[PDB]
Symmetry: C5
Subunit: 311 residues, 5 copies
């Protein structure tokens, strides 16, 4: 019921820990992710200390209403964290060990520039409100911070679950207090995105490049334009995988460059035809012969420039 | 338990403030957006005033049930806001400082005409119901209205968070009262919409225009019609980004104009062929040669007209 | 707590009113729509009447549990409405003024035959269960039925919000009682549907009709078949706007007719080619020349027939 | 309160009835359907019998808590039904008449083989748990089973609402008891599925068959392959209507056969070309001339065979 | 009330059982599934034992509050299950028989590698928290574990509902306890996936292979490229069925191989044309003639390699 009284001006330290059981629903559209984990809280309350002789046992189990529990909340969540309390154990010195199982949709922005090689830092912000009697400060108990052997992260590599040990206070409210940040560093796995996205998109463009080894303007127009259609269609096919970003992404820049190369390939084919029809087939043949190397070289070069710009 | 009594006929002033922590799920289809913010309320209640010497402390903390709190509600929300109280502090003169954290889906119409340069005014309407003893009026505390330094609005520029200082009363109910409006002026960022939507859609049309530099009717039909298909496919590709509006938008007018240009390009190619087959190749060559300039010129001109009409 | 006793056998009249604040989620698939509105109830209870001098105030505010409130329910809703009470005010004569804010998904069938010119009648059925002590009858207070100046209905014209003043009793239950119907007559806005749906779909078909002014079978096959593809693609593009109806709609009949015209156009092109190859170019030329008028004429005629059949 | 005592060993008979008011959300994907209906329960309790002379009235109205009500539940629901009680009336002999309004998602498998002519049997399984004091058995009161005149079933014909009078006991639990089944036999309406799905899909294939009346290999390749594309596109267009079934459906078999016919048509066109180029234009002409009849004939036969196999 | 006291140090055994009534919402995207089942709990409480002679009846029915009930929770659920209790019966020896109906979204990872032949193990983890007075251990009662005769799993074969008899303790919390696992082994049905996905996808590729029996470079380019488009379109058509996996799946590898074969087929056609134009038609004819066998052989071989690698 009542908060524990402070022996001195020192604030009450609440040790926190999150044991990630499962992470489901990775909505790349809303930049939200659902989490199911264990939340552990540890704090010393002299009020519940006892002697083990007269009490008999070494541990005392209470119900959430029977004792005082700090109001711990999550900052970046869609709605209040659904709470299922598991156990409350008090040690002889009065140290309370709280454990609850929770599940909540977390708001965590994602940077899609480096996609599909991008690395992300998922954040889970813990916060506590200090009362008039008593101030409450949060701490991280590394022994209660962990991820299970059955942690499944399909498509990502879990780099580090290391929570922010020094989490700066958010000056939003009138009274500033330290909000314990939980940084989960992950890196995207890409073994599929090449054979499923990049490679076939390169194949269609290379097919368009066969117009440099032909003289029939009709066949060349069919090649370039029909391949352009195939490219659009393929983009429609993979649209789900690609991200709808208001900023420029690496992938998006490659796509744009491919569109430019289709335009230039059209220009080339048209010029070659015009020169042949205007009775100068020597120039037409020279341009086409040059394009056979120029296009792949310029493409590979611009890809190195792009890669350099983004990485 | 009871409303504060007025010393004179003057109404009770409730100072309001909203500190926007995070804005997620910006559904352009339903024209709704989810918000997570702090709501602060400030009002003077003489009933809770005290002397700080005999009471000892300078501030007095109460629970929501213990004291009277004005019934503040949001007008344009899908459903009732999340009700999580953070703190209630009473100063020696009796001034109550209320703070709560809420999360709610806000209903706010969006004008998509100027898209993708469109600017929007997001509205958050605050309202209070006046009691029999004393009427209650709302006010804006500019010191408690703010956005954090890390608030990032992906895809938008935040122009002004300036809430309506003079919010007209909504004559909806039987008793009219001032409803405090919160205008958030934002402007769309477009650094991506050109390379991802406009530019490739211009490329496909320009490809269709190469039929003016060819004489093979077969190749020209393939160029124009196949490019038309590529255009439809590309629209399907970007369909998600484009808005389903029941009124005419700037983008939609450009799209329609592109469809018209494909039709006219077909007409040209057909006429050229007919004149050649109908033994007048001088006219055919003159029309095609003219079209080489006419089409781009007329396009850029009509585009300037469109821009002028919408801006 | 207890129902007001009737002074005579007359039933208790509950005056109702619905103030539609916002209407979101217009599901064309389920024929359901979500509504957010104010519900006002007014009825006279002598038990709560008082004198304003000895009582001091002119209005008396109660809590929902403190007094009797009629059990008002909605018939055509997915589930029970959102129950958020706003205010309860009692006038000196005992007249109770109840106000609540609700949000619920309403079930209302939609007729898509006349689409996209279709007019609809949205229904909201109010119902009350009469108790043994005194029967309760519903009435409409036209002064409390209204829509705000900020009422947004994007794409529709609100014809009449006139609720059914004489709503017949539904003989479903064992005891029949009058259920207050709320008819919202609306008519679809089409300022976009011509330039966004009809016109480009007509353009593609007309492009297919250019095969009648050409003799090259290859170019004609490309024109007709490729335009047919463009037609399918365009339908996919506009798919969201068109309705998935199990009955035949006007738009759907037009679409089917367009498919038929593509088939016939194929037949024509094939016949013309066969006659030319089978050494009778006079007949081929006569058929093609006739088709140049026959196709548009028959189309416009059948279009007039369709319009007549549906309107 | 307590259950009514049996005069003899006979079980308590609870007469049931369901009045289907509206049926919304027909998810053919999840094979679930939402229902909103009235549930009526009737049973004789001597404990509540009275004389109408000393009591004055002929009917006695109670509240659900005041008297005993059997625990009736639904078997095939996603989650527990909506519980809104309408009326409880007791006759002088003690016969209780219970009426409640409910809304619940019913889980009911659908057989899509005969689609789009398929007939379905929707099931609603009622169940009651027998207590130690007296066993409870369910019965069907045909007078309380009905569907309103405003029952709307868009796209289906309601064959019979006849609930299972002899519903076999589910040996699921340890104690087997009869579970009252409610069979709703419906048949699909198809006046739209032919002009919207079948007919245009036949048109595209017939267009592919025009390659048998031409000798230009280029035009034939364009015809067959481009029509194949048009076929895929049309399937994408109607994809929503067609079902994603893990077993073989009639429609799915037709679709597969059409794909085979496109493959064979390709073979024919290629062979014809090869024979002509390999200086045997005689074989090519005989095969093509035969195919002109063979393809439609074989198609119609295989179509009758399919119909016979499925019906 | 209070937990039952142990006669000796042995822990309290709670026998569990889950009777799966219905399984809806099989989200292959989120790898979650919704379940509706009965949960039965059985445990002996000496405190409630009675003699059936003095009490009269053989069974005693209690309310959940009246007696002690173990706190059973699910590990891998989105949120706490729906809690609707059905019955609580106590036998004369004191053995309590608890039955509740629940509905909850279960988190279960799915392995899509072997798709569409893949087999899955759905997991439902039961857990109980031991109190200070007496430790509680869970057990599985197979007589209360079952699935109804009307259990519907459209598209899957239910192999075994056998729960983990020896479920290892999860060392997540501070105090390790055995968590009863419920393994539901299922295998995917594929009688449709061949005629609906594989077969037509093979048909289009085989159509591309007809370019090896033709010499017209124009027709071959049309064949290969247009079939490539048809392939992309078909993937778009079936996109819903295929899984968006971040790892390499068997199906995904087949798809990639098909894309490679389209690229190689393009190369072949181009080489053949180049050799013919460069005045060496003997080599061109030899390559084409070889490809006619090489392509199917290499395809079938690599397909056998893939099957072997995944199975």
């Amino acid at each position: 019921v009542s908060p524990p009284p402070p022996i001195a001006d020192e604030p009450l330290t609440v040790n926190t820990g999150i044991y990630l059981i499962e992470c489901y629903s990775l909505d790349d559209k809303a930049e939200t992710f659902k989490v199911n984990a264990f939340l552990s809280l540890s704090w010393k309350d002299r009020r519940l200390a006892f002697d083990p002789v007269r009490s008999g046992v070494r541990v005392k189990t209470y119900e959430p209403e029977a004792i005082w529990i700090p109001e711990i909340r999550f900052v970046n969540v869609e709605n209040a964290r659904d709470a299922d309390v598991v156990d409350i154990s008090v040690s002889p010195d009065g140290t309370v060990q709280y454990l609850e199982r929770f599940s909540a949709r977390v708001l965590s922005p994602l940077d899609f520039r480096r996609y599909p090689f991008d690395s992300q830092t998922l954040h889970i912000y813990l916060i506590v409100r200090s009362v008039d009697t008593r101030n409450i400060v949060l701490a991280v108990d590394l022994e209660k911070v962990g991820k299970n052997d059955d942690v499944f992260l399909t498509g990502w590599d879990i780099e580090s679950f290391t929570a922010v040990v020094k989490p700066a206070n958010f000056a939003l409210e009138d009274r500033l207090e330290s909000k314990l940040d939980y940084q989960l560093r992950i890196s995207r796995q890409y073994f599929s995105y090449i054979p499923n996205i990049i490679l076939p998109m390169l194949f269609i463009l290379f097919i368009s490049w066969t117009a440099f080894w032909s003289t029939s303007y009709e066949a060349n127009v069919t090649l370039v334009v029909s391949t352009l259609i195939a490219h659009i269609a393929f983009n429609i096919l993979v649209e789900t995988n690609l991200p709808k970003t208001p900023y420029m992404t690496y992938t998006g820049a490659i796509i744009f460059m491919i569109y430019l190369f289709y335009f230039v390939a059209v220009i080339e084919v048209t010029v070659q035809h015009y020169l042949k029809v205007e009775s100068q087939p020597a120039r037409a043949a020279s341009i086409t012969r040059a394009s056979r190397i120029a296009f792949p070289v310029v493409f590979l070069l611009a890809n190195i420039i792009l890669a350099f710009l983004f990485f």
